[PDB]
Amino acid sequence: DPSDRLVPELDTIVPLESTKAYNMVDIIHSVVDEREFFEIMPNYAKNIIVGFARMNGRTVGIVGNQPKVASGCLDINSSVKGARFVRFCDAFNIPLITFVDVPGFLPGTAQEYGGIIRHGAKLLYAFAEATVPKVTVITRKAYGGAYDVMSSKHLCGDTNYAWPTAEIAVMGAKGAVEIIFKGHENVEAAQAEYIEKFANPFPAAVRGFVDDIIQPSSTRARICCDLDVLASKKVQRPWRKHANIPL
Amino acid sequence: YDPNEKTFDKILVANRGEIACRVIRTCKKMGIKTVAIHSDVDASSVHVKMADEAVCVGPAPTSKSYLNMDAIMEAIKKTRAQAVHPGYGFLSENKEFARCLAAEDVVFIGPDTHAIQAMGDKIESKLLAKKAEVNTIPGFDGVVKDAEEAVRIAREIGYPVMIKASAGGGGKGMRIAWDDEETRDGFRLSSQEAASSFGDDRLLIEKFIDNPRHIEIQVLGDKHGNALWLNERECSIQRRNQKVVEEAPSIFLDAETRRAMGEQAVALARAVKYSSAGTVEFLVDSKKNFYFLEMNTRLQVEHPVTECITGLDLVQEMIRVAKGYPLRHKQADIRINGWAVECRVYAEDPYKSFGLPSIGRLSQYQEPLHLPGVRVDSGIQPGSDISIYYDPMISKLITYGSDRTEALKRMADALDNYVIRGVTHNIALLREVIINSRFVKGDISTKFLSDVYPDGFKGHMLTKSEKNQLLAIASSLFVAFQLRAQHFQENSRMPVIKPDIANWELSVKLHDKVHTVVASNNGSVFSVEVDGSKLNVTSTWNLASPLLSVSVDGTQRTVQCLSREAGGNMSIQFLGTVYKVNILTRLAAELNKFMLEKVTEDTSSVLRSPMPGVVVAVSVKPGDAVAEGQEICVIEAMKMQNSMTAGKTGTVKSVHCQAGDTVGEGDLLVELE
Amino acid sequence: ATSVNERIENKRRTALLGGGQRRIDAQHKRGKLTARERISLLLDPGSFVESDMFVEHRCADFGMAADKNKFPGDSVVTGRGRINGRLVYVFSQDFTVFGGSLSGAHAQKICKIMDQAITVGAPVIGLNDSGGARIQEGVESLAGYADIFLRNVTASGVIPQISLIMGPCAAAAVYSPALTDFTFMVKDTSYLFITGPDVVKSVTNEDVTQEELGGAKTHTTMSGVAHRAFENDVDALCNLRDFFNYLPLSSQDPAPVRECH
Numbered sequence A: 001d002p003s004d005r006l007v008p009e010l011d012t013i014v015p016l017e018s019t020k021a022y023n024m025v026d027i028i029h030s031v032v033d034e035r036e037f038f039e040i041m042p043n044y045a046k047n048i049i050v051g052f053a054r055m056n057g058r059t060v061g062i063v064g065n066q067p068k069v070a071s072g073c074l075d076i077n078s079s080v081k082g083a084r085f086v087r088f089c090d091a092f093n094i095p096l097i098t099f100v101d102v103p104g105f106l107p108g109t110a111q112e113y114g115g116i117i118r119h120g121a122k123l124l125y126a127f128a129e130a131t132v133p134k135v136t137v138i139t140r141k142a143y144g145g146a147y148d149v150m151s152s153k154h155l156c157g158d159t160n161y162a163w164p165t166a167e168i169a170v171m172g173a174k175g176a177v178e179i180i181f182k183g184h185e186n187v188e189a190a191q192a193e194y195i196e197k198f199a200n201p202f203p204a205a206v207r208g209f210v211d212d213i214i215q216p217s218s219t220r221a222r223i224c225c226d227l228d229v230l231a232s233k234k235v236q237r238p239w240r241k242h243a244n245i246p247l
Numbered sequence B: 001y002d003p004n005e006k007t008f009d010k011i012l013v014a015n016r017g018e019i020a021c022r023v024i025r026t027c028k029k030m031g032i033k034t035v036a037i038h039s040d041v042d043a044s045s046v047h048v049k050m051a052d053e054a055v056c057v058g059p060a061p062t063s064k065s066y067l068n069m070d071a072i073m074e075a076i077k078k079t080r081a082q083a084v085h086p087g088y089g090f091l092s093e094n095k096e097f098a099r100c101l102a103a104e105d106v107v108f109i110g111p112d113t114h115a116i117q118a119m120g121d122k123i124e125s126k127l128l129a130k131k132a133e134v135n136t137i138p139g140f141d142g143v144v145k146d147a148e149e150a151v152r153i154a155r156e157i158g159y160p161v162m163i164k165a166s167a168g169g170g171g172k173g174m175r176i177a178w179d180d181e182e183t184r185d186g187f188r189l190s191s192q193e194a195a196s197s198f199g200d201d202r203l204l205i206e207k208f209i210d211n212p213r214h215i216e217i218q219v220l221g222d223k224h225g226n227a228l229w230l231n232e233r234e235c236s237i238q239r240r241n242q243k244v245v246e247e248a249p250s251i252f253l254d255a256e257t258r259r260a261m262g263e264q265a266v267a268l269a270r271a272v273k274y275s276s277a278g279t280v281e282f283l284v285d286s287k288k289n290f291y292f293l294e295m296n297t298r299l300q301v302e303h304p305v306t307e308c309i310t311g312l313d314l315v316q317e318m319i320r321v322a323k324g325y326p327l328r329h330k331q332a333d334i335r336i337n338g339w340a341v342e343c344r345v346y347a348e349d350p351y352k353s354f355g356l357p358s359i360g361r362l363s364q365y366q367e368p369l370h371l372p373g374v375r376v377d378s379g380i381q382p383g384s385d386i387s388i389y390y391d392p393m394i395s396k397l398i399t400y401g402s403d404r405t406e407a408l409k410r411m412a413d414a415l416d417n418y419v420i421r422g423v424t425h426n427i428a429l430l431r432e433v434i435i436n437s438r439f440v441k442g443d444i445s446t447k448f449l450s451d452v453y454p455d456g457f458k459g460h461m462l463t464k465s466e467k468n469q470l471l472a473i474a475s476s477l478f479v480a481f482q483l484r485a486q487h488f489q490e491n492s493r494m495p496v497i498k499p500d501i502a503n504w505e506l507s508v509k510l511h512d513k514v515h516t517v518v519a520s521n522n523g524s525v526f527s528v529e530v531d532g533s534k535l536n537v538t539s540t541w542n543l544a545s546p547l548l549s550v551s552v553d554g555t556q557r558t559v560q561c562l563s564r565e566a567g568g569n570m571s572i573q574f575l576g577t578v579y580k581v582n583i584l585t586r587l588a589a590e591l592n593k594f595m596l597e598k599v600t601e602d603t604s605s606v607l608r609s610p611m612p613g614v615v616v617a618v619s620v621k622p623g624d625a626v627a628e629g630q631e632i633c634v635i636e637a638m639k640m641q642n643s644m645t646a647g648k649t650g651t652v653k654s655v656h657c658q659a660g661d662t663v664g665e666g667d668l669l670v671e672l673e
Numbered sequence C: 001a002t003s004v005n006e007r008i009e010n011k012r013r014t015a016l017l018g019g020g021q022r023r024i025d026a027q028h029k030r031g032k033l034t035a036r037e038r039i040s041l042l043l044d045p046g047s048f049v050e051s052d053m054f055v056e057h058r059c060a061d062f063g064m065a066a067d068k069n070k071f072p073g074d075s076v077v078t079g080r081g082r083i084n085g086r087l088v089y090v091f092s093q094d095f096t097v098f099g100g101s102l103s104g105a106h107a108q109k110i111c112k113i114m115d116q117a118i119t120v121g122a123p124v125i126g127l128n129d130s131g132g133a134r135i136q137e138g139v140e141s142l143a144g145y146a147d148i149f150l151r152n153v154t155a156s157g158v159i160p161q162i163s164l165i166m167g168p169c170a171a172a173a174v175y176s177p178a179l180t181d182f183t184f185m186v187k188d189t190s191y192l193f194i195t196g197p198d199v200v201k202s203v204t205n206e207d208v209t210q211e212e213l214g215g216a217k218t219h220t221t222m223s224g225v226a227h228r229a230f231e232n233d234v235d236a237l238c239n240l241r242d243f244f245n246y247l248p249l250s251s252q253d254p255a256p257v258r259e260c261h
C-alpha cells in the first residue's frame, strides 16, 4: 500500500450543513493501510472511536469522534474509554492519530452528578502527557474546552491539520452573537459579519493554531510523511515518581 | 473538429450525469463555452466541475430542480446562453419547453415542436407511418372504447393481443391477451389502469409478436431536408422493459434487410420533416419481417455504441445541424467499422428481480481505461452518492473490436477489471450474460433474461475446473497473508525466529462443501493440491491493490478480495461473482468441530424492506392472513415502483410501515407467522 | 518635567481598586471578598510580592481597545508569598474585571507564575472566581486555557497544586481545578458546572438551579469532585493555611516534620 495514495472519496464526505452527520469509520478506513482497522470497544460508548491500525506498515493508534452517536459529544464513558487507550499507546511508543469533530460535552444533571469534570480531565490529561508523536486532523466542529481536550496543538501536539469544512471557535456563532452583541439588538448584520469572519478555520490558521489547511484527498499522504519525520521525536520532562491523574 | 467553424459561443446543458459530461466534452472539443445547471445535492458532480460556470436551479427533487421551467429560464437569461442541449429525459420531449425556448431568441438543439407533437401520441404516429408507407404492426386505427370493438379487432389481428396504452414510457400501460375472454377482460383492466394513470382511456390494440428482436435505426436529419441512416442497433436483452446490453451491428440482419430498414426510416423521417438525430425502433420477428414501433425524438442512451462503428460524433453533428449547416456526409459515406458492444452498469442488486435499486456512497471507484478498446461514459467519481431522486445508473461501458468475439472478450476483461466499492452493482449479471452460450451464438430475444433464468439470477455456476481454480487462488491468498504477517523489521534486541513450515493443511468451506487443501510455497509460486488435483498459482502477490492478477496452470485470472477476517472468512470476486469461502487450518477445523452452533433467529415470519425509498401505500394490516405471492406494500424510488411479495402464508402479527412514510433499506415493515 | 511618576502612581491606584469601587461594593454585598484581600488573608503579613502588575490585555475586536476596556492586571492578581515561613506561589482571579473571564494576559500571568514555581520547586495555590472564557478574545482565550492545562499536567507529581473555588466557574474554567491534587469549595458561593441550567433546560428539559447543578454540597456529597466545603471565605482561607502546613514543598523533599509534644 503506497504511502502517497490519494483518497478523493473524502473530498465530499463531510456534509455542508452541520445538522447532518457522517461516519468517521469511513474516514478511518479510507486513510489507514489496506483499510484494516482493529476497533477497541466497538459497542460501548459509541460516540468515540479508538483502535489500532497501520500507516506505512507502522502500528498507530486511532482516536476519533463519531458524529453519528450523540452528535459526537463527549461524556463520561467516552472520556474514560479514550483516556485509557491513549495512555496505553503512549506507554508503548505507539503514535496517535486523532480525528476531531466535537461540539462539546453532553449536558444534563446525570453527567454532572456522575462527575463529568473528572472524566473530561482524565481524557485531557491523557492527551497532554503523551510524549509519542501525535497527528491531529479537524474535519468540522471544535468548540470550547473540548477542542483543548481533543489533542490541541497547545498540548505539545506535533502537527495539526484542518479540512476546509473545519471551524474552531469558543462556542457557536449564534450564541457568540447573542453573548457579544447583547445590547446592540441589531444582530441582523452582526450575525452575517460574524459568520463570514469567524465561522471558518482562518482564525485558528492566522494565529498558527493549525499548521495548514489541507485538501481532504491528501490526508493519508500528509500523515505518513509526518510519521516518517516524527519517529525520532524525543522530549524531556521534570523528574517524578509518578503524576496524580484524576482517577 | 474545426474551431474555425463559427458555431455558438455558449451552450447550456439542461441535464445531468453521463449525458451532461458527454455533451460538455463534445462542446469543449469544439471550443465552445458551456453552462451547467444542477440541484443543491449535485453541487460537486463531475459535470459541474468539468464545465465552466454553474447554476443551482433548485432543491434535490427533479420536479423542482431539472423540471423547473422558471429556474432554467432565469439561468439562461443570466448566462446569456445561445443554445441549449436537453440530452435525453427530463425536458427533452416537452413542447412547452420548446415554446419558451423559441420565444425570445434562443434555439433548441433537437427536433422541432411539430415533430415532437406528431411522435408524442402513438395513434397519430402510427397513422403518419402508414401514410409514409412504412410497415406497421397489425392493428386497428383510432381509439378502442368497447369490448365488442376489441374482440372485433382481435378477429383480424388473431388471438395474440398486445394491449398498450397511449404514452407511458418505460414499459408502463402494456398488457398481453391470448383469447377473446382474455381480450375483453384485459381491455376492461387496461381501461381501468388508463383511467387511474392519466385518465386518457386511449388504448391501442395490436398483434403480439412472438420472440421479437428490438432493432433501432439511428437517423440523422438536418433543416435542408437530408436524412441519413447510420446502420442499426440491437437491444434485445432487457429486464423490466429496459435495455441493459446493446449490440451495435445486428448479427441477425444482413445487408439487404439493413438497407431496406434504413430506407424506410429515412422515408418516415422525411415525412415527419425530422431535423435532428433520432431513432426509429422495430420489432423484427424470426422470419426477418420488421414492424414499426415508436420513434424516439431525442438523443438515444445507447448512441455511443454506433459511434464506434461509424466514427461520427452524434452530439457534434446535432450541434452543427442546430447551427444551420447541412450534413457533411452522404449515405455512401456511412460504413461499418467493426463491432461494438455496450453494457449499462447500474447501482442495483441483480439477485432481486434482475435488479433492485440500491443507495449508498462510493468508497472506491476505478475504470479499466488502460485496457485496449474500452470507452467509459460515467458521470460519477470516487465519493459520489447514489440518491433515490435520480437514475441509479452508474456508467456505460463500450468495447469495440474487429469482430464480435474480440469485442465480447474485451468486454469480459473490462468487466473483470472494473472496481466499484460502496454500493451493489449488476456486473455479475452483465458478465454472466456476455459469456452465455446463447448470447455468443446469437439466438436472443426480448425475453432472454426471463427464460435463461426462470427462478432468477443465482450467479455464475462455476464448473469443476473453475471451482478448483477458485479454491487454489483462495488458499494461495490465505497463505500469502500468513507469510506477510511474519515479515517484521529487525529488532536487534529480540530477533524474530521465522517458522519454517513447508506444507499448509487447510480446510476450505465453500457453499456447503468442505475441501482439504495442501498448499506449498516456492517464492512467487504456490503449489496447491485440492482433493488430489494439483495446480500452480503464480502472481506478484500484491495484497493491497484492489485488483489481483494470477496465473493458474497458465490461465490468467483477475480476482478481487472484497473482505477478509481473522476468523477465516473471505469474499472473493472471481469471474464476476462474489463467493464466500471460510479457510481454517486443519487443527483449527478439528477443534472447531466441538464448538456449539449459535441459535439463529430466522424462521421467516418477518419481511423487512428490500428496497429504500418511499412507500406509496400499505396493503396489509395487523391480523391479516396473507398468502404466497401477495404483495405486502409498494415502494417507489428512482422512477420505479416495486411491490414485494410475502412469499409465505401467515397472519400478520404487526405492521410497522405506514403509507407515505420514508422507509430505508432493511427496515422491518410487517411481521407475520 | 516628566509625568511618568504620576502615570505610574495612577496605574498602581487603578490596579489596587481593580474594576472600580462600585463593583467592589457589589462583590461585598454578595458576601465575597476581593482577590487582593483574599491574598492578604492567605499569606503571612508583609510577605506578598506581586508580579506582572501592569500587564493589560491586547484584544482589539468589538471595541475592546477603548480606554474604558483597559485594566492593569486583567482580572488576575499573581505573585509569591510565604505561609508559616514556607514559600508558595499564588494566583487569585478577580471577578471585578470582566467577570473574571480569562484572556491572553490572564493566562500569560498564570503560566508565568506556574513556570516560576516549577523552576524553584514550590507549591501553587489558586483561588478560582471566573465567569469563563472571554468571548471577545476568541480562540486566543481557548489557547490560554490549554496552556494552563499543559502546565497542570507537567507539574503533576512534581509540586503540590491546590485549588480553592470561591465563585462561579463554568465552561473550560472547571478543568484546571480537576487536574490539581486537592480542590476545596465555599458553601453557597462557589459553583462548578460545564453548562449552565439554561442550556440544561434547552437540551434535556429539566428544572434545576445553579446550587443544585454545581453547588458545594453537590460536589462534596454526590459528585466526588470537591474534597471539602467551607462556610465562608475567611474560614476557608484559615483551613487552607492549616492544610498547607501538612504538605511538602516538592516531590524531592521528605515529608514535613514539626515539633511534637
Ligand SMILES: CCC(=O)SCCNC(=O)CCNC(=O)[C@H](O)C(C)(C)COP(=O)(O)OP(=O)(O)OC[C@H]1O[C@@H](n2cnc3c(N)ncnc32)[C@H](O)[C@@H]1OP(=O)(O)O
Residues within 6 Å of the ligand: A104, A105, A143, A144, A145, A146, A170, A171, C095, C096, C097, C098, C099, C100, C101, C130, C131, C132, C133, C134, C135, C136, C168, C169, C170, C171, C172, C194, C195, C196
Ligand atoms: C467547555 C464547554 C464550553 O465551552 S460551554 C460555552 C462557553 N461558555 C463561556 O465561555 C462563558 C460561560 N459563562 C457565562 O456565560 C456567565 O459568565 C455565567 C458564569 C453563566 C454567569 O455567571 P454570573 O454569576 O451571573 O456572573 P455575572 O453575569 O454577574 O458577570 C457579569 C460580568 O461578567 C462578564 N462575563 C462573564 N462571562 C464572560 C465572557 N465569556 N466573556 C466576556 N465577559 C464575560 C460579563 O461581560 C460582565 O462583565 P462586567 O464585569 O459586568 O463588566
Ligand SMILES: Nc1ncnc2c1ncn2[C@@H]1O[C@H](COP(=O)(O)OP(=O)(O)OP(=O)(O)O)[C@@H](O)[C@H]1O
Residues within 6 Å of the ligand: B137, B162, B164, B167, B168, B169, B170, B171, B172, B206, B207, B208, B209, B212, B214, B241, B281, B283, B293, B294, B296, B446
Ligand atoms: N406489440 C408488441 N408485441 C410484442 N412486444 C411488444 C409489443 N409492444 C411492446 N413490446 C415490448 O415492450 C417493449 C417496450 O416497447 P416500447 O419501446 O414501445 O416501450 P416504451 O416504454 O413506450 O418506450 P420508451 O422508453 O422509448 O418511451 C418492447 O421493447 C418490446 O419488448
Ligand SMILES: *C(=O)CCCC[C@@H]1SC[C@@H]2NC(=O)N[C@@H]21
Residues within 6 Å of the ligand: B062, B088, B089, B090, B170, B389, B390, B391, B639
Ligand atoms: C431521474 O433522475 C431521471 C432519469 C433520466 C430519465 C430516464 S433515463 C431512461 C428513461 N428514458 C428516458 O428518456 N427517460 C428515462
Ligand SMILES: [Mg+2]
Residues within 6 Å of the ligand: B281, B294, B296
Ligand atoms: Mg424506445
